[PDB]
Symmetry: D3
Subunit: 276 residues, 6 copies
């Protein structure tokens, strides 16, 4: 099959990196490159990266001065030469059929993007949580409009579990020096697609063991864009009000006083001064 570029930012993940990389090299889909972006790690991560590159030529390492998760992913996008691009966090790990299932779902359906789900691995108790079961499996093709009504963490704020045509990345980059960088970026990729295929299987494992300002501004930017493009706003509005409520309280708890004022005011307007 055609080349898939797997972008893996690496920053101080010495405990988890080998499990991640082992799960990737065992992929049943063979035609991939793994772009490891070592973002200036200060533990053994960089040495682990180098050792893995020595035994599999599909691994390419990029060492860079520490610049954040956004910069690391952008470097990956730049270096990628695949027809498709996908992200894996170096904290996490996948089933051996992960890539193949994503690839088939995309290509067989003529979609521009395929997306799967994730199950959880609790590091503290070394136990899986199989939230997504075989009996609950489904697959569906979605228009962008149908897609934008749908799990909000999975869909909008989590960069892995998703296979993208590389062409979709024209003009699209993660925002620098900013957390919730996934929240600000992934949905812009969806907006460039014509069809998206979702497979409800937890083939990606999320290892289970911030930025209030971005939480709010990401949601505002996204509402403005969707509104300008003619998409329905109902769910984003619900999401936005929920974030404002969290921001209002947490900003105050964190001594982020100007942010607290803004969020409480916005919440006050929405709840107490709606139209009519």
């Amino acid at each position: 099959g055609e080349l898939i570029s797997i972008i893996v930012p690496v920053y101080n993940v010495e405990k988890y990196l080998k499990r991640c990389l082992d799960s990737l090299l065992r992929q049943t889909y063979k035609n991939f490159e793994i772009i490891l972006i070592n973002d200036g790690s200060t533990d053994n991560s960089s040495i682990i990266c180098e050792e893995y590159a020595k035994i599999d030529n599909r691994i390419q390492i990029l060492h860079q001065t520490n610049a954040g998760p956004s910069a690391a992913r952008n470097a990956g996008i730049t270096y990628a030469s695949g027809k498709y691009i996908t992200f894996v966090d170096s904290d996490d790990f996948v089933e051996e059929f992960y890539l193949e299932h994503l690839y088939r779902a995309l290509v067989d359906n003529g979609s521009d993007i395929s997306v799967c789900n994730f199950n959880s691995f609790n590091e503290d108790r070394q136990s899986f949580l199989f939230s997504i079961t075989k009996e609950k499996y489904f697959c569906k093709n979605y228009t962008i409009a149908e897609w934008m009504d749908l799990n909000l963490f999975l869909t909008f704020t989590f960069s892995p579990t998703k296979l993208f045509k590389a062409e979709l990345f024209e003009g699209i980059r993660f925002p620098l020096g900013r957390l919730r960088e996934d929240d600000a970026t992934i949905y812009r990729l969806y907006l460039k697609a014509s069809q998206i295929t979702f497979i409800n299987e937890g083939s990606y494992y999320y290892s289970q063991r911030d930025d209030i300002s971005s939480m709010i501004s990401n949601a505002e930017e996204r509402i403005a864009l969707l509104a300008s493009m003619g998409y329905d706003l109902t769910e984003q509005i619900k999401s936005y009000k929920g974030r404002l409520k969290k921001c209002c309280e947490d900003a105050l708890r964190n001594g982020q006083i100007e942010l607290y004022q803004q969020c409480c005011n916005k919440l006050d307007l929405i709840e107490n001064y709606p139209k009519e």
Copy 2:
């Protein structure tokens, strides 16, 4: 009549301050206080403020360490003891009936805000531009919904020309260390009101002689807020698209590269990827 608080930020306006203050002391509406906020001026402005305070007891001076126009206006709001609050920029000036007309328009109509228009004074040629003529005079009461539809500068980005019930300022402050502060704030006051009265009268004179990131952020926040409150988005969407175009080009010219990418991508999505 009831006390009107006039908030006047002062930063290095020695050439224009006396003209401003003279035009305010000549007001036919006499029950006011002028709150001069000297934002750490380094010219003669502070001395001019002190001299005017000595001859009229309606003038109150606040000297503060330089912190920007938003901080200066916020100090004004905090110090105001009037039933109503209005803003005057210290390089502008007004007709002697300015305050009286705004006060009448508000109180006689049972509105929460009254708004007038402005004409221009060209400092370079010392000539007035009477864009707003007596033949074009009108007055009208608006619902908030009617008011929000469309002079975008007069309505949303310009803080003077407007008389606000002081009660409207609960939870509302200008955003710190950041220009287009009026653009981020005035419309939130409108959203608190039940009715607004406009008088199409150029009684305020704007003396004629960029924060590109805020231009975009302000518009996104405002769309998200209006959408969440059920207001129509048609004109804000048009305004947003126009700002994106301006941003896309000007950010690039200024070497603001990440801003440029974000705006160009947003403009690309809107123009080339609207909902199918």
Copy 3:
């Protein structure tokens, strides 16, 4: 009686704030406002402030970006609308007759300031230290000259225990970004007064559990000021020499070398080169 404004700076005092506020709400003198200035606390203090504000309308909260104890007290003074102003630290607490006794001492004597004493509460052993006993109770009126002669901590470095006519604060603010702020400020209030009434009563409880440069600067400024106003300097001189000794040794221990040289030189001049 007339309104007393109680200014209470709050920064990360979650363990002690409730005890403080409970003791204030139980005041037998009921015509007060409590101005809580949350100086950007990062613990639960801000939430505790909000909860108390919901149950007593005499409580006014000001949330501000963290700027230090001087800035917080200055905001308090600016916001106070009382005829009298008093300070309470948020880790301390008071007798239920605290305010009443200070108010009586001031008003019945025609003084401009009344001052009481304090006893101690040892948090580590949960035990009171009643240094000031009923057998030692006295009350006395003082001229400013009598007052300035000498408990140096109680009088000059401690802002609570004192009820001030609000008029005394014209031109007087705590110095920004700088500790021993009380040491720099309280005595300037005394200098504005005509008479001070002291009550030797430990009605305030100080919870028991360095800015070396300011220690010296404050003492030099105060001597210069008193000398310029014709006050006797004998005790201030003794205090200054004691501070120089402390400075000379502690600056050196802290690696504050230029401060050390300055203080040692000053101490050397005073002890070894007095006027022949």
Copy 4:
């Protein structure tokens, strides 16, 4: 005669340095060293220093990273090996008998310090101002007390025109990174002396072509020291009030708002609330 160390800080004085150094090498008193401290000059001053050192072995150069006039003088004091120390600014120049007259005045009278006066040279008009004339010449021995009652620029804030026994410098250094460094330092040298000899001759020529905070704190520190040592305060008090008046006005003009508040308050206390 015994060795005199002449300390000459040099910072960007290319236009004036040769005139200064020429006037020094022509001294009738031959036993001197000139310590040129080049404080990281960025013009030709450093090259001029090196060229002069090549032709007279009494010149010693010390090049140092830019650190200010205080640091440059302190380096000079440290390098000095003379029995006496004197300062010359590299902007200025002297008569050929300058050093000899200072030396004789000190040694013949058994004084610890000798001081002369200065006349002016107006660079803009290339003309001398002989303010100090031959007919006005006098010489006098002073006790420290007599000395401290006396021209305030000449005596207290100007480091040149003065020959000091080197022993007087134990523990005494110019304050770092601070202007009016002379104001803070010279009088401490006087306080270590037993007798001072003044000669009223303008043998030093001051070339005629800031720090408000230090102006005030230097005067406060000096009053506190003098008071502690038992010296009369009358003139220092007059001086202090004059500085407060200048500070109050100039701080405000410069946007130094906290300084303005402090100085105006101090002036208000002194003028309007003196004892009784």
Copy 5:
């Protein structure tokens, strides 16, 4: 022929960029890409880049936040997909046969690098200086040892005029934030080669109209490398001694005192303490 990547850093060169780009698009060698790295220009350079990109698809633009000439070139190297890499400064321009002649000289000779010379253009007088004439034309193949035995500016400190096999860039990047970045880098590419071909034609035009520390450390690094690899040091030593002389004087003129001390000491050792 095979693809040549031309790396063109662009920072604030609006006056010269069109001339540069016009001369490149007129190349007789057709198979190239021009990688324009706009390094956050703040003039019209970015817009000029965009306009040229629209009319010739061999032009690729990378806009980046300003990070300096080294970072710009490194981005070019990373983006380059040619078999050969060459550098052109956007201030300069070339003959229409420039690329073709470099290409032939490399390929026909089996060299890894080809190098030509340059003539100059005086912008102030709009006149060419034809230092390299037709009569002085020669071409020659060199071993690296012969090559490293040489003017000095052309060979080591100037990145254009040179066509490199792209494989030579493994592990070689320009040093960040550093000026004299060419000085630190070009020679390392030479050391990777087996044979270099020089053509003595001035087909590149240098438009004519310092980091002292790097000048010295670059020469020291280069001597240490060459010595470690067994190359002859005679000319590098001569060059190093010349740089020390320049540094010794110019560091002092610039107030770079520690650098002055180091260079003067080094020059002192070399000239006055050679081996016995």
Copy 6:
């Protein structure tokens, strides 16, 4: 005998300082000064320095604002008035005949420098390691060429154990803010000498309980100097290659990515592209 200046930098060594100073005051060679440079210590070191100064007048203290070990030693060199200069680290201690043996070895041989060896003391186990035994004692006079042909730590990167003619320090200072400051400096003193005497006795005790960039640049600077002066480079090259290997690996482990790139490239050139 003539005065030996012992330079002892002191920074936060309260646990070890008394042992150091006791061992120095017990020297059989009596004519020394100990220059204690307290570099702004924040423990009890400064007070320990003062106490020792009070009981032995050979001890001089310089207190300075913290500026690092290089600045501390340079201050020592400046203050030193001895005919000879030696360094002792305040963590360490010496035999009672330490100074005497160094002095005799220098003076009896007509050398400019004498050097001894060191044994170690393991603080964790309170036990001596006598690496240098009586049986292995030797003494020898070396030419500089013989001297520069050598362990490596003792000779070049350790400042104690060495007695220098003070005239050798002309133009030689330790580099500011730099670690491996000994590495950059000691060898330059050797290059000033005509003959060096080594005594193989461990009379200095090193108490036992990295700046990668300097490690590399120091070695490059030293190779360039030695090459320029005609000394043999064989051992320095071996040392340099060893440092590159260490840097290549450890820079990467520390996230020092540009340094890693430079060192790995240098090592790549040396090992894989030596001269043909």
